[PDB]
Coordinates of C-alpha atoms and ligand atoms in Angstrom, one line a residue:
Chain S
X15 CA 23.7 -31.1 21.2
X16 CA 21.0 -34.4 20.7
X17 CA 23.5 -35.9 18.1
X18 CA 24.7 -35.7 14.6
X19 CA 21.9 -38.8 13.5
X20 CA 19.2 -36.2 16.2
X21 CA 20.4 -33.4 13.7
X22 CA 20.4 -35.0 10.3
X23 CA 16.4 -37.1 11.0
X24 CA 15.1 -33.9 12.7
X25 CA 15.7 -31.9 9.5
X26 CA 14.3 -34.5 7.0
X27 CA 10.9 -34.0 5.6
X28 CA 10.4 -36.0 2.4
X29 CA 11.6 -40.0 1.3
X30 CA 11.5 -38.3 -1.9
X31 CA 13.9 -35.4 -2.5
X32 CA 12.8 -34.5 -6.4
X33 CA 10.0 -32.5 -5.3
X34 CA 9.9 -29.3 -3.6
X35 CA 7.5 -28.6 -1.1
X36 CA 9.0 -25.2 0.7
X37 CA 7.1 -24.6 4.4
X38 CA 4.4 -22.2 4.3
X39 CA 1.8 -21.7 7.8
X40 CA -0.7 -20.3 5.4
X41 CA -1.0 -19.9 1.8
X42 CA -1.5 -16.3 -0.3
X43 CA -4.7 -15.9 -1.9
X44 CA -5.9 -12.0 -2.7
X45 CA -4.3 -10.6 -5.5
X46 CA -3.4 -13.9 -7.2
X47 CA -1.3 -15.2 -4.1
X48 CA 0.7 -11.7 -3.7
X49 CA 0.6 -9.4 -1.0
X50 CA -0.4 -5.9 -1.8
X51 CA 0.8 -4.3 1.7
X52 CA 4.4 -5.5 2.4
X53 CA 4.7 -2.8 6.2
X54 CA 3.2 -2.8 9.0
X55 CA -0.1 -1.9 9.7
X56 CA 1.3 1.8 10.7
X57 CA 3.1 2.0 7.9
X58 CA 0.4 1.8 5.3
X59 CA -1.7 3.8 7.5
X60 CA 0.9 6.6 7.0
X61 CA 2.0 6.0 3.5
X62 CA -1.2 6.0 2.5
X63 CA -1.1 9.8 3.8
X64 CA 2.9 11.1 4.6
X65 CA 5.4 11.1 2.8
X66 CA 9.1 9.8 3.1
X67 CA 7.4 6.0 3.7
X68 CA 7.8 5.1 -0.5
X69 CA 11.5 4.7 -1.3
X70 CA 10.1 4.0 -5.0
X71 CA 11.5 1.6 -7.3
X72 CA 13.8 3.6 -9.2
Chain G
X4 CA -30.3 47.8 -30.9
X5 CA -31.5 45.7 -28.1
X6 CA -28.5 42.6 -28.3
X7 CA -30.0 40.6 -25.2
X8 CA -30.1 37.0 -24.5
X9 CA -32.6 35.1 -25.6
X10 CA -35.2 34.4 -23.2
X11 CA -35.0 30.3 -22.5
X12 CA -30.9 31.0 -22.2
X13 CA -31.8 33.9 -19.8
X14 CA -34.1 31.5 -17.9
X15 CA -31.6 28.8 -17.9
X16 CA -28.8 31.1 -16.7
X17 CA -30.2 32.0 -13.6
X18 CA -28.8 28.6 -12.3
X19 CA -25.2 28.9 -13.4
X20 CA -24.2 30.7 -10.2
X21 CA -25.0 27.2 -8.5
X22 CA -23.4 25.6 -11.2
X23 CA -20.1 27.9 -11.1
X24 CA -20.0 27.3 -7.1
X25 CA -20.7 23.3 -7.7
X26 CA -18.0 22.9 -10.0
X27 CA -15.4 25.1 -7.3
X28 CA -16.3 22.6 -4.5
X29 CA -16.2 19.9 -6.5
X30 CA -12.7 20.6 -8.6
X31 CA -11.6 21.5 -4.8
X32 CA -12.5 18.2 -3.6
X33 CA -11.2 16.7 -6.2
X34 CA -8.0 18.0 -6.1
X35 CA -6.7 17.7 -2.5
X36 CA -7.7 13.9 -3.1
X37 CA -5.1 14.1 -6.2
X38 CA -2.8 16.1 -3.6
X39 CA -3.3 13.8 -0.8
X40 CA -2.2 10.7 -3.0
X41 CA 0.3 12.6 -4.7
X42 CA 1.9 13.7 -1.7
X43 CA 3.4 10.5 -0.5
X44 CA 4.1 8.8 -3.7
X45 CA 5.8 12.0 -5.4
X46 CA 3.2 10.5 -8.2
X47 CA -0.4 8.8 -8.7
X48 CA 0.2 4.9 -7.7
X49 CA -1.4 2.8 -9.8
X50 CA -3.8 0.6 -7.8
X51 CA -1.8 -2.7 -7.1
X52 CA -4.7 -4.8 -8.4
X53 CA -4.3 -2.9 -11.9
X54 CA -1.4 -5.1 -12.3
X55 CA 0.2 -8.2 -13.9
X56 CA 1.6 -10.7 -11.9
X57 CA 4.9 -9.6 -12.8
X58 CA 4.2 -6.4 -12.4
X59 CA 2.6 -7.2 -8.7
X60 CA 5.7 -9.0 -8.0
X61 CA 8.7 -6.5 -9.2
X62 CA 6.9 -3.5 -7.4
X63 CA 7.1 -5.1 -4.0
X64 CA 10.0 -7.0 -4.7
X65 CA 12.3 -4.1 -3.1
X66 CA 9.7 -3.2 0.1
X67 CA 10.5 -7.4 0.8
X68 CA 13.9 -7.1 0.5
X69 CA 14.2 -3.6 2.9
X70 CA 11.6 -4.7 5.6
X71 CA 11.6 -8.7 5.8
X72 CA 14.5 -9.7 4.0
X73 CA 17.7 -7.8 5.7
X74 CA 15.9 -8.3 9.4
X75 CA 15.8 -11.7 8.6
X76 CA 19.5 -12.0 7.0
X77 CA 21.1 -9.7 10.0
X78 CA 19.0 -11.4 12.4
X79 CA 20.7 -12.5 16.0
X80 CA 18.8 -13.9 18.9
X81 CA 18.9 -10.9 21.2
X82 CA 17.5 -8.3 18.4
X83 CA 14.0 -9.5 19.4
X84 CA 11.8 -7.8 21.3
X85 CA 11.3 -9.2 24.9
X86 CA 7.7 -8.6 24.7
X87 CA 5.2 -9.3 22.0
X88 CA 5.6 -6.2 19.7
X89 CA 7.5 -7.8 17.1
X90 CA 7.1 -7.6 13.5
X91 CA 4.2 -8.9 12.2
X92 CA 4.3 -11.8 9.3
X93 CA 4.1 -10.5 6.0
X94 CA 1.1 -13.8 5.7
X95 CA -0.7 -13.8 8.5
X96 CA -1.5 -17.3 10.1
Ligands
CDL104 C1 0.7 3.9 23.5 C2 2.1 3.6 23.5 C3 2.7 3.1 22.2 C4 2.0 1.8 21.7 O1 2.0 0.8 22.3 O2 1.4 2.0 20.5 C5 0.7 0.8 20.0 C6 1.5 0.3 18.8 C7 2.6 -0.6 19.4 O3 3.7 -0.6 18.4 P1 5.2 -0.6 18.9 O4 5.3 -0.9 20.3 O5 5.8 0.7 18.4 O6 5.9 -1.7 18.0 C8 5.1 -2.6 17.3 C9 5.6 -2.7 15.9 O7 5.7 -1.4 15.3 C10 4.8 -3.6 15.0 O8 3.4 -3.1 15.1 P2 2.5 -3.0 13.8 O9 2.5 -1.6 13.3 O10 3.0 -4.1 12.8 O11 1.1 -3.5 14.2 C11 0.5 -3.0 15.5 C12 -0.9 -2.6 15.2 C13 -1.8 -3.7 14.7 O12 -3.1 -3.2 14.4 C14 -3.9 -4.0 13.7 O13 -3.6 -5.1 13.4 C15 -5.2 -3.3 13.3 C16 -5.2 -1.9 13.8 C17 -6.6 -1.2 13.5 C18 -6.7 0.2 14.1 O14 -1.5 -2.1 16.5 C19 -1.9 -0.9 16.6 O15 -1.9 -0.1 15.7 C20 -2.5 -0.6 17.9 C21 -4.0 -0.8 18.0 C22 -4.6 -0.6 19.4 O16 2.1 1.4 18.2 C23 2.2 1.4 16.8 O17 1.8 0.5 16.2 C24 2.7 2.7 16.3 C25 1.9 3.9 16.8 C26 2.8 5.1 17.3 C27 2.0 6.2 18.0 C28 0.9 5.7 18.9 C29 0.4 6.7 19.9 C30 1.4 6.7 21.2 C31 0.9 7.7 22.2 C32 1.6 7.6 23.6 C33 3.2 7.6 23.5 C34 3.9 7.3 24.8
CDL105 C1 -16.2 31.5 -6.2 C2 -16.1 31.8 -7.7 C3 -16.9 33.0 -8.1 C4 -18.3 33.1 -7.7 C5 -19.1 31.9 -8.3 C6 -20.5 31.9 -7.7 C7 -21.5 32.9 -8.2 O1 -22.4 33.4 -7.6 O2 -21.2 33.3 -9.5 C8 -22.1 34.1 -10.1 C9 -21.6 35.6 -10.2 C10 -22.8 36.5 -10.3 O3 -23.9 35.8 -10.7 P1 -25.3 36.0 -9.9 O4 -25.5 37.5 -9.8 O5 -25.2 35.2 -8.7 O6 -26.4 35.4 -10.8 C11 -26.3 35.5 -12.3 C12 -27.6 35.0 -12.9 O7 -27.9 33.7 -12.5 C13 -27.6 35.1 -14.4 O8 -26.5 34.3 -14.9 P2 -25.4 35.0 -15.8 O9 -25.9 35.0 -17.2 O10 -25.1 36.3 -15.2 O11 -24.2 34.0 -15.7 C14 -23.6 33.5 -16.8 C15 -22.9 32.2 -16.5 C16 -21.9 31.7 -17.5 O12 -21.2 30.6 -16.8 C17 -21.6 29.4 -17.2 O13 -22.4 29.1 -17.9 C18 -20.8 28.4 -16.4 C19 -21.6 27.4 -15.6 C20 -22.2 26.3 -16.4 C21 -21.2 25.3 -17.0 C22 -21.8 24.1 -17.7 C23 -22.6 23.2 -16.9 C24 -23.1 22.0 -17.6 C25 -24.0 21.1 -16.7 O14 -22.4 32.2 -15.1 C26 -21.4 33.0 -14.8 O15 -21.0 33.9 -15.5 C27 -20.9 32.8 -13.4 C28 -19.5 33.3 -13.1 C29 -18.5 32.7 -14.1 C30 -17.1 33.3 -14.0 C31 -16.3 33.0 -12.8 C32 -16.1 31.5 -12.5 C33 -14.9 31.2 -11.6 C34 -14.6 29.8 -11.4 C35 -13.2 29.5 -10.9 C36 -12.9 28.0 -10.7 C37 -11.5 27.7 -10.4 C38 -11.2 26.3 -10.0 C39 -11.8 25.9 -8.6 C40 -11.2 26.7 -7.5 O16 -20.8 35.7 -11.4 C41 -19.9 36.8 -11.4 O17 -19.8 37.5 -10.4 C42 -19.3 36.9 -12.7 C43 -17.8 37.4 -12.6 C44 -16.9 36.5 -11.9 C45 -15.4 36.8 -12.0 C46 -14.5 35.8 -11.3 C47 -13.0 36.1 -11.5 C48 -12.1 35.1 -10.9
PC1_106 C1 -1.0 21.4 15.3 C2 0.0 20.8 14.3 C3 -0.6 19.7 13.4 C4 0.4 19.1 12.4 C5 1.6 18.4 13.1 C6 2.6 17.8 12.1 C7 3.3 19.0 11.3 C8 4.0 18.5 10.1 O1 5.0 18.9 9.6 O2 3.3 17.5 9.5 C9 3.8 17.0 8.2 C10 2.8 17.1 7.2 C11 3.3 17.2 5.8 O3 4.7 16.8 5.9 P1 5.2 15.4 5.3 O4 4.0 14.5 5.1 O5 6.1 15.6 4.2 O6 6.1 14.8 6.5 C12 7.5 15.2 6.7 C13 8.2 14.1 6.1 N1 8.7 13.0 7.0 C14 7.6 12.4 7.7 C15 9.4 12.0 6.1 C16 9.7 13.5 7.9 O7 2.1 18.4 7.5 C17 0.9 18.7 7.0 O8 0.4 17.9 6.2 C18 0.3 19.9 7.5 C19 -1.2 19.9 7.4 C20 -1.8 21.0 8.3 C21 -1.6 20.7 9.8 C22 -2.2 21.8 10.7 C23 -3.7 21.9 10.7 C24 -4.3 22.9 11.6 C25 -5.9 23.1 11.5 C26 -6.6 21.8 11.8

């Protein structure tokens, strides 16, 4: 709506295109940069004690 | 022929009631923990520390994909929540 040029400079990070340097707010650090509980806070709450929550891996 | 005990087994016996009731509780305990793990995991989860890297990553590689992935794929802007109860970040910052 600002412009095609608005668009393409708004969008542009790095002079230097080689490198990737993907956007993160925060980075991981327990279990080696992973993260152990990917729910919500009720869902591993109730996983942790109902079934039907795991849909396993197999 | 007198076939009793001997005397210190005799005098050690006489605690084996406690230890008999002990080991019920404790096997009891025990095993609703086992149950109570079991239970939603139709197994015993290994702990997700106890892993490899790999290993961390291809186990929660499918609960990414089915809770932050296809929200985020099918996504339009009137599936938001008006008010603040949204999904929370999977880091949080
Ligand atoms: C009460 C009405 C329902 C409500 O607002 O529940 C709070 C909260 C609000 O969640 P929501 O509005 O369903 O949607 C938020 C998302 O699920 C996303 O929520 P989430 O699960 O990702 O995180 C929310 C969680 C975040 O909690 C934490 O971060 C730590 C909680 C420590 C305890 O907050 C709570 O558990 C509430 C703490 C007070 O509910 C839940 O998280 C689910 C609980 C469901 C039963 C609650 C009891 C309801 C009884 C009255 C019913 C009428
Ligand atoms: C609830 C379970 C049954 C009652 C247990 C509590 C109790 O008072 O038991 C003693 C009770 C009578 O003993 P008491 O008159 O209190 O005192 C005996 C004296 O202290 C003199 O001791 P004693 O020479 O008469 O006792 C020999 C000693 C021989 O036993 C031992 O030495 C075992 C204890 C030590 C093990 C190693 C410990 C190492 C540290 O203890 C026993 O024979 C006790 C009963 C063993 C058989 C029944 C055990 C059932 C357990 C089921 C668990 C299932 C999973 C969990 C749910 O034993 C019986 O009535 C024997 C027949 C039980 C039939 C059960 C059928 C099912
Ligand atoms: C009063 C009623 C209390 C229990 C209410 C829930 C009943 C139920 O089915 O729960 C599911 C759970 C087990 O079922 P579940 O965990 O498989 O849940 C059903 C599966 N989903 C969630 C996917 C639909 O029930 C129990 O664990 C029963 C335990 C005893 C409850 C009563 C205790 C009374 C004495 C204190």
């Amino acid at each position: 709506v600002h412009g095609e040029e608005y668009a393409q400079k708004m969008q542009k990070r790095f002079h230097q295109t080689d490198i990737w340097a993907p956007f993160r707010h925060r980075y991981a650090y327990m279990y080696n940069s992973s993260n152990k509980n990917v729910k919500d806070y009720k869902q591993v709450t109730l996983s942790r004690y109902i079934n039907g929550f795991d849909k396993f891996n197999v | 022929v007198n076939t009793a005990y001997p005397t210190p087994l005799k005098t050690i016996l006489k605690t084996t009631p406690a230890f008999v009731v002990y080991f019920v509780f404790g096997l009891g305990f025990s095993t609703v923990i086992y149950d109570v793990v079991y239970h939603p995991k139709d197994r015993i989860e290994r702990f997700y520390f106890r892993s490899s890297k790999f290993e961390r990553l291809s186990r929660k590689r499918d609960e990414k994909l089915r809770h932050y992935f296809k929200p985020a794929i099918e996504w339009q802007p009137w599936y938001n929540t008006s008010t603040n109860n949204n999904t929370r970040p999977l880091l949080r910052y």
